[PDB]
Amino acid sequence: VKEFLAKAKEDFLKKWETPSQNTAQLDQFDRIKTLGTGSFGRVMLVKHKESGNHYAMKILDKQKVVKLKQIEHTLNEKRILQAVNFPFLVKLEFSFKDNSNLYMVMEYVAGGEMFSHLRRIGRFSEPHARFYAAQIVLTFEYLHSLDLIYRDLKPENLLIDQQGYIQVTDFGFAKRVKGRTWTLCGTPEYLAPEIILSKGYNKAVDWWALGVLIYEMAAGYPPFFADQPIQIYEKIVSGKVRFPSHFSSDLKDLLRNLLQVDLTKRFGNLKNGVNDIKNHKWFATTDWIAIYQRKVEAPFIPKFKGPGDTSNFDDYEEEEIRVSINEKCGKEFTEF
Protein backbone atom coordinates (compact mmCIF):
# COMPACT_ATOMS: atom_id res chain seq x y z
CA VAL A 1 0.00 0.00 0.00
CA LYS A 2 2.74 2.44 1.16
CA GLU A 3 4.82 1.44 -1.83
CA PHE A 4 2.05 2.18 -4.31
CA LEU A 5 1.21 5.30 -2.33
CA ALA A 6 4.74 6.55 -2.69
CA LYS A 7 4.85 6.05 -6.49
CA ALA A 8 1.36 7.57 -6.60
CA LYS A 9 2.53 10.64 -4.75
CA GLU A 10 5.12 11.47 -7.38
CA ASP A 11 2.62 11.51 -10.20
CA PHE A 12 0.31 13.60 -8.05
CA LEU A 13 2.93 16.22 -7.57
CA LYS A 14 4.00 16.22 -11.17
CA LYS A 15 0.45 17.08 -12.38
CA TRP A 16 -0.18 19.08 -9.21
CA GLU A 17 2.67 21.40 -10.07
CA THR A 18 1.97 21.85 -13.75
CA PRO A 19 -1.74 21.33 -14.13
CA SER A 20 -3.41 20.82 -17.57
CA GLN A 21 -5.47 23.63 -19.12
CA ASN A 22 -7.97 24.42 -21.92
CA THR A 23 -7.82 20.96 -23.29
CA ALA A 24 -11.06 21.13 -25.45
CA GLN A 25 -13.54 23.71 -26.91
CA LEU A 26 -17.30 23.44 -26.59
CA ASP A 27 -17.74 23.12 -30.38
CA GLN A 28 -16.63 19.49 -30.21
CA PHE A 29 -19.51 18.33 -28.00
CA ASP A 30 -23.15 17.57 -28.31
CA ARG A 31 -25.46 18.50 -25.54
CA ILE A 32 -27.69 15.51 -24.96
CA LYS A 33 -29.40 15.76 -21.42
CA THR A 34 -28.95 17.12 -17.86
CA LEU A 35 -27.95 14.30 -15.40
CA GLY A 36 -27.88 16.40 -12.27
CA THR A 37 -28.15 19.78 -10.76
CA GLY A 38 -26.24 21.40 -7.99
CA SER A 39 -25.66 24.40 -5.87
CA PHE A 40 -23.27 26.27 -8.29
CA GLY A 41 -24.01 24.71 -11.80
CA ARG A 42 -25.00 21.45 -13.69
CA VAL A 43 -23.81 18.20 -15.33
CA MET A 44 -24.98 17.03 -18.65
CA LEU A 45 -24.36 14.02 -20.98
CA VAL A 46 -22.37 15.21 -23.88
CA LYS A 47 -21.06 13.46 -26.97
CA HIS A 48 -17.76 14.16 -28.41
CA LYS A 49 -18.38 14.88 -32.11
CA GLU A 50 -14.94 13.68 -33.23
CA SER A 51 -14.66 10.43 -31.25
CA GLY A 52 -18.37 9.57 -30.91
CA ASN A 53 -17.63 8.85 -27.27
CA HIS A 54 -19.92 10.02 -24.41
CA TYR A 55 -18.87 12.17 -21.45
CA ALA A 56 -20.38 14.15 -18.50
CA MET A 57 -19.68 17.91 -18.64
CA LYS A 58 -19.95 19.94 -15.43
CA ILE A 59 -20.89 23.43 -16.47
CA LEU A 60 -20.16 26.20 -13.83
CA ASP A 61 -21.36 29.79 -14.34
CA LYS A 62 -18.51 32.15 -13.46
CA GLN A 63 -20.65 34.97 -11.90
CA LYS A 64 -22.88 32.50 -9.84
CA VAL A 65 -19.55 31.00 -8.72
CA VAL A 66 -18.25 34.44 -7.66
CA LYS A 67 -21.59 35.26 -5.93
CA LEU A 68 -21.64 32.19 -3.83
CA LYS A 69 -17.90 32.84 -2.89
CA GLN A 70 -16.82 29.70 -4.56
CA ILE A 71 -13.94 31.07 -6.55
CA GLU A 72 -11.18 29.34 -4.66
CA HIS A 73 -13.01 25.95 -4.26
CA THR A 74 -13.56 25.78 -8.12
CA LEU A 75 -9.80 25.96 -8.85
CA ASN A 76 -9.02 23.40 -6.10
CA GLU A 77 -11.58 21.12 -7.79
CA LYS A 78 -10.08 21.47 -11.23
CA ARG A 79 -6.56 21.20 -9.92
CA ILE A 80 -7.08 18.02 -7.78
CA LEU A 81 -9.12 16.37 -10.64
CA GLN A 82 -6.55 16.89 -13.33
CA ALA A 83 -3.89 15.62 -10.95
CA VAL A 84 -5.39 12.48 -9.43
CA ASN A 85 -5.70 8.90 -10.61
CA PHE A 86 -7.26 6.03 -8.65
CA PRO A 87 -9.78 3.25 -9.66
CA PHE A 88 -12.80 4.60 -7.74
CA LEU A 89 -12.44 8.34 -8.68
CA VAL A 90 -13.85 9.73 -11.96
CA LYS A 91 -11.48 10.77 -14.49
CA LEU A 92 -11.49 14.38 -15.67
CA GLU A 93 -10.78 14.25 -19.39
CA PHE A 94 -10.89 17.87 -20.64
CA SER A 95 -11.32 21.20 -18.86
CA PHE A 96 -11.79 24.51 -20.67
CA LYS A 97 -13.59 27.83 -20.09
CA ASP A 98 -15.34 30.64 -22.01
CA ASN A 99 -16.96 34.07 -21.68
CA SER A 100 -19.58 32.77 -19.37
CA ASN A 101 -18.82 29.39 -17.98
CA LEU A 102 -16.16 26.98 -16.81
CA TYR A 103 -16.31 23.36 -17.97
CA MET A 104 -14.97 20.12 -16.77
CA VAL A 105 -15.63 17.05 -19.06
CA MET A 106 -15.08 13.69 -17.50
CA GLU A 107 -16.07 10.08 -18.03
CA TYR A 108 -19.87 9.35 -18.04
CA VAL A 109 -20.69 6.68 -15.48
CA ALA A 110 -24.04 5.33 -16.59
CA GLY A 111 -24.96 3.45 -13.51
CA GLY A 112 -26.69 6.35 -11.78
CA GLU A 113 -25.96 7.67 -8.28
CA MET A 114 -25.80 5.24 -5.24
CA PHE A 115 -28.46 7.55 -3.96
CA SER A 116 -31.17 6.50 -6.48
CA HIS A 117 -30.68 2.90 -5.76
CA LEU A 118 -30.40 3.34 -1.96
CA ARG A 119 -33.66 5.09 -1.80
CA ARG A 120 -35.32 2.61 -4.25
CA ILE A 121 -34.02 -0.67 -2.83
CA GLY A 122 -34.63 0.94 0.60
CA ARG A 123 -31.36 -0.18 2.22
CA PHE A 124 -28.40 -2.34 1.68
CA SER A 125 -27.54 -5.54 3.38
CA GLU A 126 -24.38 -5.43 5.39
CA PRO A 127 -22.41 -7.45 2.72
CA HIS A 128 -23.35 -4.85 0.12
CA ALA A 129 -22.84 -1.81 2.43
CA ARG A 130 -19.38 -3.32 3.25
CA PHE A 131 -18.64 -3.74 -0.51
CA TYR A 132 -19.03 -0.03 -1.10
CA ALA A 133 -17.39 0.95 2.21
CA ALA A 134 -14.17 -0.78 1.30
CA GLN A 135 -13.88 1.25 -1.84
CA ILE A 136 -14.24 4.41 0.23
CA VAL A 137 -11.81 3.31 3.10
CA LEU A 138 -9.20 2.91 0.23
CA THR A 139 -10.14 5.98 -1.83
CA PHE A 140 -9.78 7.95 1.30
CA GLU A 141 -6.56 6.28 2.23
CA TYR A 142 -5.20 7.41 -1.11
CA LEU A 143 -6.78 10.90 -1.16
CA HIS A 144 -5.63 11.51 2.39
CA SER A 145 -2.10 10.38 1.64
CA LEU A 146 -1.84 13.13 -0.97
CA ASP A 147 -2.71 15.64 1.79
CA LEU A 148 -6.13 16.00 0.20
CA ILE A 149 -9.36 16.18 2.17
CA TYR A 150 -12.54 15.43 0.03
CA ARG A 151 -15.20 17.22 2.13
CA ASP A 152 -18.51 15.99 0.58
CA LEU A 153 -19.19 12.22 0.90
CA LYS A 154 -22.81 11.37 0.49
CA PRO A 155 -24.87 9.01 -1.68
CA GLU A 156 -25.59 11.61 -4.22
CA ASN A 157 -21.77 11.71 -5.03
CA LEU A 158 -20.85 8.04 -5.48
CA LEU A 159 -21.78 7.08 -9.06
CA ILE A 160 -22.19 3.26 -9.70
CA ASP A 161 -20.26 2.01 -12.79
CA GLN A 162 -20.87 -0.79 -15.34
CA GLN A 163 -19.20 -3.40 -13.23
CA GLY A 164 -21.20 -2.41 -9.98
CA TYR A 165 -18.14 -0.38 -8.54
CA ILE A 166 -17.88 3.21 -7.17
CA GLN A 167 -16.78 6.43 -8.73
CA VAL A 168 -16.39 9.34 -6.39
CA THR A 169 -17.31 12.50 -8.42
CA ASP A 170 -17.57 16.23 -7.46
CA PHE A 171 -14.39 17.41 -5.96
CA GLY A 172 -15.88 20.84 -5.33
CA PHE A 173 -14.76 21.08 -1.74
CA ALA A 174 -11.62 18.94 -2.00
CA LYS A 175 -8.72 20.90 -0.56
CA ARG A 176 -4.99 20.02 -0.34
CA VAL A 177 -3.91 21.00 3.20
CA LYS A 178 -1.10 19.79 5.42
CA GLY A 179 -2.57 20.95 8.77
CA ARG A 180 -5.97 22.58 9.61
CA THR A 181 -8.71 24.27 7.71
CA TRP A 182 -11.78 26.15 8.87
CA THR A 183 -14.36 26.45 5.98
CA LEU A 184 -17.98 25.48 6.74
CA CYS A 185 -18.81 23.22 3.82
CA GLY A 186 -20.41 19.90 3.28
CA THR A 187 -23.97 18.56 3.31
CA PRO A 188 -25.57 19.12 6.74
CA GLU A 189 -26.12 15.40 7.54
CA TYR A 190 -22.64 14.51 6.91
CA LEU A 191 -20.91 17.31 8.87
CA ALA A 192 -18.46 16.05 11.62
CA PRO A 193 -19.19 18.11 14.85
CA GLU A 194 -15.90 19.96 14.77
CA ILE A 195 -17.01 21.63 11.59
CA ILE A 196 -20.29 22.78 13.04
CA LEU A 197 -18.51 23.88 16.20
CA SER A 198 -15.98 25.95 14.16
CA LYS A 199 -12.99 24.42 15.81
CA GLY A 200 -10.68 23.97 12.83
CA TYR A 201 -10.60 20.50 11.48
CA ASN A 202 -8.77 18.00 9.38
CA LYS A 203 -8.77 14.68 7.50
CA ALA A 204 -10.79 13.06 10.28
CA VAL A 205 -13.93 14.69 9.12
CA ASP A 206 -13.71 12.32 6.17
CA TRP A 207 -13.80 9.37 8.60
CA TRP A 208 -16.88 10.74 10.49
CA ALA A 209 -18.64 11.13 7.09
CA LEU A 210 -17.69 7.51 6.06
CA GLY A 211 -19.29 6.43 9.30
CA VAL A 212 -22.38 8.40 8.36
CA LEU A 213 -22.34 6.72 4.92
CA ILE A 214 -22.23 3.11 6.20
CA TYR A 215 -25.19 3.96 8.54
CA GLU A 216 -27.37 5.46 5.82
CA MET A 217 -26.48 2.62 3.49
CA ALA A 218 -27.29 -0.20 5.99
CA ALA A 219 -30.32 1.40 7.65
CA GLY A 220 -32.08 3.33 4.90
CA TYR A 221 -31.74 6.74 6.73
CA PRO A 222 -28.96 9.00 8.05
CA PRO A 223 -28.04 8.68 11.83
CA PHE A 224 -29.02 12.33 12.34
CA PHE A 225 -31.73 13.69 10.08
CA ALA A 226 -34.48 16.41 10.69
CA ASP A 227 -36.38 19.02 8.67
CA GLN A 228 -34.15 21.89 9.20
CA PRO A 229 -30.35 21.86 8.99
CA ILE A 230 -30.36 23.54 12.31
CA GLN A 231 -32.19 20.76 13.97
CA ILE A 232 -29.80 18.28 12.30
CA TYR A 233 -26.60 19.98 13.62
CA GLU A 234 -28.17 20.07 17.06
CA LYS A 235 -28.42 16.27 16.91
CA ILE A 236 -24.81 15.71 15.36
CA VAL A 237 -23.12 17.59 18.12
CA SER A 238 -24.83 15.75 21.00
CA GLY A 239 -23.61 12.59 19.36
CA LYS A 240 -26.09 10.24 20.92
CA VAL A 241 -26.59 7.68 18.11
CA ARG A 242 -29.35 5.01 18.13
CA PHE A 243 -28.77 1.87 15.93
CA PRO A 244 -31.33 -0.38 14.10
CA SER A 245 -31.81 -3.80 15.66
CA HIS A 246 -30.61 -5.46 12.37
CA PHE A 247 -27.03 -4.15 12.90
CA SER A 248 -24.41 -6.64 13.78
CA SER A 249 -22.46 -6.07 16.90
CA ASP A 250 -19.45 -5.61 14.75
CA LEU A 251 -21.03 -2.98 12.56
CA LYS A 252 -22.35 -1.20 15.61
CA ASP A 253 -18.76 -1.28 17.07
CA LEU A 254 -17.39 0.05 13.75
CA LEU A 255 -19.89 2.99 13.64
CA ARG A 256 -19.39 3.50 17.25
CA ASN A 257 -15.76 4.11 16.41
CA LEU A 258 -16.16 6.28 13.41
CA LEU A 259 -19.03 8.59 14.71
CA GLN A 260 -16.95 9.41 17.69
CA VAL A 261 -17.15 13.06 18.83
CA ASP A 262 -13.71 13.08 20.29
CA LEU A 263 -11.27 13.21 17.41
CA THR A 264 -8.61 11.87 19.73
CA LYS A 265 -10.44 8.63 20.01
CA ARG A 266 -11.86 8.60 16.37
CA PHE A 267 -11.03 5.65 14.13
CA GLY A 268 -8.92 6.71 11.18
CA ASN A 269 -7.60 9.66 13.31
CA LEU A 270 -5.53 7.41 15.63
CA LYS A 271 -2.01 5.98 15.62
CA ASN A 272 -2.52 2.98 13.19
CA GLY A 273 -4.30 5.40 10.81
CA VAL A 274 -6.54 3.61 8.45
CA ASN A 275 -5.35 0.24 9.54
CA ASP A 276 -7.56 0.44 12.64
CA ILE A 277 -10.40 0.39 10.03
CA LYS A 278 -9.05 -2.16 7.58
CA ASN A 279 -8.60 -4.62 10.49
CA HIS A 280 -11.81 -4.05 12.51
CA LYS A 281 -14.01 -7.12 12.92
CA TRP A 282 -16.53 -5.99 10.24
CA PHE A 283 -14.02 -6.02 7.42
CA ALA A 284 -12.59 -9.40 8.12
CA THR A 285 -14.15 -10.90 4.97
CA THR A 286 -12.74 -7.95 3.03
CA ASP A 287 -9.98 -8.93 0.62
CA TRP A 288 -8.59 -5.41 0.16
CA ILE A 289 -6.39 -6.03 -2.89
CA ALA A 290 -9.24 -7.92 -4.64
CA ILE A 291 -11.34 -4.92 -4.09
CA TYR A 292 -8.74 -2.60 -5.46
CA GLN A 293 -8.12 -4.93 -8.26
CA ARG A 294 -11.83 -4.76 -9.19
CA LYS A 295 -12.22 -8.50 -9.16
CA VAL A 296 -14.58 -8.93 -6.21
CA GLU A 297 -17.82 -9.69 -7.89
CA ALA A 298 -20.29 -6.75 -7.85
CA PRO A 299 -23.49 -7.21 -5.60
CA PHE A 300 -25.70 -5.15 -7.71
CA ILE A 301 -25.01 -4.28 -11.33
CA PRO A 302 -27.15 -1.81 -13.32
CA LYS A 303 -28.54 -2.60 -16.63
CA PHE A 304 -27.11 -0.17 -19.07
CA LYS A 305 -29.28 -0.36 -22.26
CA GLY A 306 -26.34 0.52 -24.38
CA PRO A 307 -24.53 3.73 -25.16
CA GLY A 308 -25.66 6.88 -23.75
CA ASP A 309 -28.44 5.31 -21.80
CA THR A 310 -29.54 7.85 -19.22
CA SER A 311 -32.36 5.73 -17.64
CA ASN A 312 -30.44 5.28 -14.29
CA PHE A 313 -30.58 9.13 -13.89
CA ASP A 314 -33.68 11.30 -12.95
CA ASP A 315 -35.12 13.76 -15.28
CA TYR A 316 -34.09 17.26 -14.76
CA GLU A 317 -35.45 20.29 -16.61
CA GLU A 318 -33.20 21.69 -19.30
CA GLU A 319 -31.82 25.23 -19.13
CA GLU A 320 -29.84 26.48 -22.18
CA ILE A 321 -26.11 26.83 -21.61
CA ARG A 322 -25.51 30.26 -23.15
CA VAL A 323 -22.24 32.22 -23.44
CA SER A 324 -22.00 35.97 -23.49
CA ILE A 325 -20.15 38.10 -26.01
CA ASN A 326 -18.25 39.74 -23.12
CA GLU A 327 -15.83 37.86 -21.12
CA LYS A 328 -17.26 37.58 -17.68
CA CYS A 329 -15.06 36.90 -14.56
CA GLY A 330 -11.72 37.21 -16.30
CA LYS A 331 -9.11 37.71 -13.67
CA GLU A 332 -10.46 35.42 -11.12
CA PHE A 333 -10.45 32.42 -13.23
CA THR A 334 -7.18 32.92 -15.07
CA GLU A 335 -5.68 29.63 -13.90
CA PHE A 336 -8.55 27.28 -14.79
Partner: peptide
Protein backbone atom coordinates in the same frame (compact mmCIF):
# COMPACT_ATOMS: atom_id res chain seq x y z
CA UNK B 1 -40.71 3.54 13.08
CA UNK B 2 -37.61 5.54 12.31
CA UNK B 3 -37.84 4.63 8.70
CA UNK B 4 -41.37 5.95 8.81
CA UNK B 5 -40.21 9.20 10.31
CA UNK B 6 -37.47 9.68 7.80
CA UNK B 7 -39.95 9.26 4.90
CA UNK B 8 -42.37 11.86 5.89
CA UNK B 9 -39.45 14.15 6.55
CA UNK B 10 -38.76 16.71 3.89
CA UNK B 11 -35.04 15.73 3.41
CA UNK B 12 -35.58 12.50 1.50
CA UNK B 13 -34.35 14.03 -1.80
CA UNK B 14 -30.92 15.01 -3.02
CA UNK B 15 -29.55 17.06 -0.16
CA UNK B 16 -27.63 20.21 -1.35
CA UNK B 17 -24.33 21.47 -0.11
CA UNK B 18 -24.07 24.29 2.23
CA UNK B 19 -21.44 26.66 1.00
CA UNK B 20 -21.72 28.68 4.03
Amino acid sequence: TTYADFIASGRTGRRNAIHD
